[PDB]
C-alpha cells in the first residue's frame, strides 16, 4: 500500500487498523525504509551508523529520534504517538530486519 | 557495433570502480501481495545478476550513492516532497533509473526437464513429491571428517566412503590415515620408526658393525661410476658438515670414556543388518577350481583339479603354442 | 635384473601384462553424502598391480586403461633411488595409497587431477603437515626426507649419498678437479630432478612417453 | 509454503494440453474433431459431471509416458488431474464452474 | 579372529566360502555316493557341474530362484556342517546363500567375459529354496526347541485366504506443508514422525498416514491338512496355518497335496481388540520357504 492509503482509515479506531496484516506490512515496509534511506545535511545515513556502533558494542538498544520519522513520514509518527505497543512491535522486527544486512550471527545471541 | 561495445566495456570500467549503488523498496501504487512476491522475485534475480557481474552493494542509502534503481515512476520526481529520496538525488546528482530503463541496461549489456526424465528420476531417486533442500533419509550425511571417493555422473558406486568418529582418531601415534613422519634407516616414511629409535647407543653399535662390513662393497660401488655410467674407465668425495654414524658413535665412546575371488558390487539389507550380531568364538585361491582352500596339497587331492588335470582340450591353445616352440 | 660389474639390466614377469587397442538435477545432492544401501555398480578395474606402485589412474579406475601405468612406476623407482627409501610406498589398501598420493602433492592437487578424470575428490578435516602440499614440488619433500634420517644419525658414512644433501641444501638455501666433479654432478643431479618433476604428471595425455623421455638433455652422454 | 509436485505439475499440464489437443479423423466426412472438447460442450448443455476418456487416446500421446504415468500412480496424480480438467473447463466452458 | 552370530554359530565368511566352493565344485555323482547307488553313476550328466549349468541357465531364462537340496550339501565334504546351519538357522545361512548365488552370477560372467550386462544381474535380487531338509516329522511331535528351524511337512490344502496386503513401507505426509517422508519396516514396526522433518515446517503431530502411496507386499494364509508318514496312537489329523510370501502367493489351490518346506514360527496372538495385551500361549505356524 501507500502512505496516502495510511492516511485514510477504514476501521474506526486506531488499534484494530494497525492490528490488521496488509496494514501491518505495509507499516514494517516503511519502517523498513524509513531506516535505510533517511540521511543526515552531511550526507552520512545517521541510522547505519547507529546500527553499526550498536553492533559493535554488542548491544540491543537502537536510538530512533522521533523529529526525524516526524519530518520524514509524519502518519508513522502520529500511529507511533497514538498506538505505541502495537507500532514498537512491529518497528522491533523492522529494526532486526535492518541489523540482520549486516550481521547475521546478531539474531543468534540476541 | 564496435564502438559501441568499446563504449560499453569502458562504461563497464567505470561503473565497476567508481559507482555506489543502492535500490528502492517502497511503492507509489496500491498492489496485491501475491504481485508483490513477483517484485521481490524481480529485485532478487536483478540483485543476483549484478552480483554476477561483480559489484559490492551496501544495504544503506548514503552520499557515496550513484546509481539508484527505484520501482516508483520517472514521471513523478519533480513533483514530491524534499525529505523523499528522489530530490535529495536530483539534487545530489545522481541518475536515477526505473525497471524499463535498468531491465534494457542490463540486457543491452548482456531446458524443460520433460516427463519421461522426471519419471526416470522417479525410478531411481525415490519422489520428487518431498522438499528437495532437506536432508533424505536413506542417504548418509557427513558430520565427521571424512573421504569420499565418489563419481560426478553417479552411475558408478561412490567408491570409497569412510569417516572417522573422533574417538577413533583420538590417538596421535596410530591414525587410520598416512601421515609422513618419515622415520629412519631405510624405512618406509609412513609406517616409521615407532618400535624403536636409533638415537640408542646400543642400536648404534650393530649400524656401526653392518657398516663395517659395507665399506669394502661400497667401494667398488663408488669406484665404477666415479666418472662414467659405462664400464668406459683413486676416488674423490664431497666432504659435508652434516654428522655421520661413525662421529655418533665416536661421541658415544667419548660419553663412555593372492588373487581371490570375485563378489557382486552391492549387498544385500540382511546382510548388513547381520553386521550389528557379530561376536568372537598355506591357504590361497585356485582360479582353474574357482574355489579357496585351506591348504594347496588338499586342493591337488581334489576331483575337480584331477578332473580338470587329466582333461587336454582347456590347454589347446598351449599346445599349438608347445608345437610351434618346438620347431622354432 | 640388473649386474653391477657388466652394467647392464634386462626385464622378466609379463605375466600381468597385457594390450590395448583403444547434466544437473535438482535435489538428490550427493556431493555431501552416501546412500545408506548402495544400488549402482563399482566399475570393473583392471587392478592387477603390486602395492605401491599402482598407477594413480589405477587407483582411480579408469575405464580406459593407458600405457603409462609403467613410466609412472619407474619414475617411482627413481624417486625411490633418489630418496634412499626402499619400500617408500606401502598400501595397506586403496584408499590408503590415495592419502598417500595425497600427503605429497595436495589435496588441491589431486582435485584437478581428479577432474580431468570425471570424479570429484573432497577431505574433511585430515589434520597433516603441508595443507596444499608442496608448490615447490618434490624438492623440499626428499631434503626433510634426508633430513631426519640425517639428523637422527643412522644413515651410513658414504659420500655416494650425502653429495645429494649438499645439493638439496644449497637450493633450499638459496683442487680444480674437485670443482670439475663439482659442476659436473651439480648440473646432472639438478637435471634428474627437473626431468623427475616431468616423470611425476598426473594427467596422462600431459605426461610425456618414454621416447620423449629419452631425447631430454639429461640423458646426453648415453647418446 | 507448501512443496510442489514438479512430475504432478507436468502430468497436470500433459493432461491440460491433452484435453485441448487431442483429435481424430471423421469417418463419414475425414474433418479433424477434437473430441475431447466436444465433450466439454456436451457436458455443457446438458449439466453432466463425468468426463469419459479412453485409454488408448491416451496412450497415443508421446512415447506413452502421460498414460504409464496415470497408470501406475493414478491415486497420486487423481487431484492433478482433476484441476487440470479444472482449468480447461474454465478457459472453455466457465458455466460448469458455478454448480 | 573369526565373528559368530550372536544365538549361532554361523559366520558369514566362513559359510559364503563353502557355499561358493560347494556352488562351484558340486557334482551329482556325489549324491549318487550319498545314496549308496554306485552301479547308477553315468559320465554324461554326474560328471557335469550341476549349479554351474543350473546357474547358467538361470541367467539365460532369467530365473531370479535356486532350488537347492540340502541332502546335497550332505553329499559334498565341506558343507556337512552347513547343512545343519541351513536347519538351526534358516533365516541368515537363507541370507548368505542368497548373498553368494549373487556373487557367484556376477563371477560367471566377470571371469569367463560374456556378453550379458553386470547391470541387471546386480540389480536383480536372487533368493534360493533350500528343500528336502529332512525327515518329515509331524507338527504335533514338535517342541518349542524347534522353533526357527527348517521342516519339511506332507500335506492336503483345504482353503486360502485372500491376498492380503502387509505393509513393506510407509508413507507420511504432512498437514501443513505437504512434506512426505518414507520409513521402512523394521521386524515389523514402523517408526510415525512425531514432528515434520523440514526446518521451515516443524509442526507437531502434523504428519498423517497415507494408506494407498506407501507400498504392500504379498502376504497369503493357507490351511493346509498334514499328512504325516508316521502317526502315534490315537493321533487324529489336524490343519496348520502355512504363510506363503510374495511370489509363492496363489501358487498352490485348494485340494492339491504338497510338499512344503519352511521355518517353524511362533507368535503371540493378542487376547482383545482395543488392548495390547498379549497371550502367554503362543500360535505356531510354517513361514513357507518352498512347494514342491
Ligand atoms: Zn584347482
Ligand atoms: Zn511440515
Redesign the interface.
Known sequence: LTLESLSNVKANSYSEWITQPNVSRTIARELKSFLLEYTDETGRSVYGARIRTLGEMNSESLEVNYRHLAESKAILALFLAKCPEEMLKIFDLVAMEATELHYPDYARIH | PKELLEWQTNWKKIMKRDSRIYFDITDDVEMNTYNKSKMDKRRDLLKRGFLTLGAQITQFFDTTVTIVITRRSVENIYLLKDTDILSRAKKNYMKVWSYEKAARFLKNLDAAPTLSNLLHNEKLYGPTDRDPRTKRDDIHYFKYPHVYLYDLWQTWAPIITLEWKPQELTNLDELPYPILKIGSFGRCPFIGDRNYDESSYKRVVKRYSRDKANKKYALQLRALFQYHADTLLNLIFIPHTCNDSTKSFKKWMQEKAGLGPTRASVMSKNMKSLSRLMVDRNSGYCENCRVKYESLEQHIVSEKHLSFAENDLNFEAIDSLIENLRFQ | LFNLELGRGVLVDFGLAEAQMDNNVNGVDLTKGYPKNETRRIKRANRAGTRGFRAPEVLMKCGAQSTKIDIWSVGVILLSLLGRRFPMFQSLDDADSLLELCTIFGWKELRKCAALHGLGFEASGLIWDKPNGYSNGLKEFVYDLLNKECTIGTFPEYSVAFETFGFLQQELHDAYELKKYQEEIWSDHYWCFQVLEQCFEMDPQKRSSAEDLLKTPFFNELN | ???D????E??RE?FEQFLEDFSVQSTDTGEVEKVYRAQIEFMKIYDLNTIYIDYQHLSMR??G??A??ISEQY??FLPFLQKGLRRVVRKYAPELLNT | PLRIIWGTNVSIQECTTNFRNFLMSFKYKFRKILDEREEFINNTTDEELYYIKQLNEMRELGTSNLNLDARNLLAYKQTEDLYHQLLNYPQEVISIMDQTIKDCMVSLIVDNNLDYDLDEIETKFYKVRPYNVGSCKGMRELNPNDIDKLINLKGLVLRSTPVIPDMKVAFFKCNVCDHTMAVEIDRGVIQEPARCERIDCNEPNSMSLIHNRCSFADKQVIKLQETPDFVPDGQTPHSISLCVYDELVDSCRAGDRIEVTGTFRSIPIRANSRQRVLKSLYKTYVDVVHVK
Open positions: 509454503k507448501k512443496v509436485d514438479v512430475t504432478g507436468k502430468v500433459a508421446e512415447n509416458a502421460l504409464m504415468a491415486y497420486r
